[PDB]
């Protein structure tokens, strides 16, 4: 008989780590075994 007020928050607490993929040299490639 009593409907709770569904609030619109969503907690998380889940660190990824940190980004380290922009320092490395980037080269787009083709069919494998270059």
């Amino acid at each position: 008989f009593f409907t709770p007020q569904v609030l619109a928050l969503e907690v998380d607490c889940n660190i990824e780590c940190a980004s380290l993929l922009d320092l490395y040299g980037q080269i787009e490639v083709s069919r494998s075994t270059f």
């Binding site: 922009d22 980037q26 080269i27 787009e28 083709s30």
Partner: protein, 38 residues
């Protein structure tokens, strides 16, 4: 005027990767056009 929102984002999502400076033509295409001039 310009809306800056094209449907060409379907590839930068994952199919492409931003900030890579990819070459415009395959190396095979270059050498193929190379030997084809002789």
């Amino acid at each position: 005027p310009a809306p800056s929102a094209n449907p060409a984002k379907i590839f930068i999502r994952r199919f492409f990767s931003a900030g890579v400076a990819k070459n415009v033509v395959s190396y095979s295409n270059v050498m193929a056009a190379q030997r084809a001039m002789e």
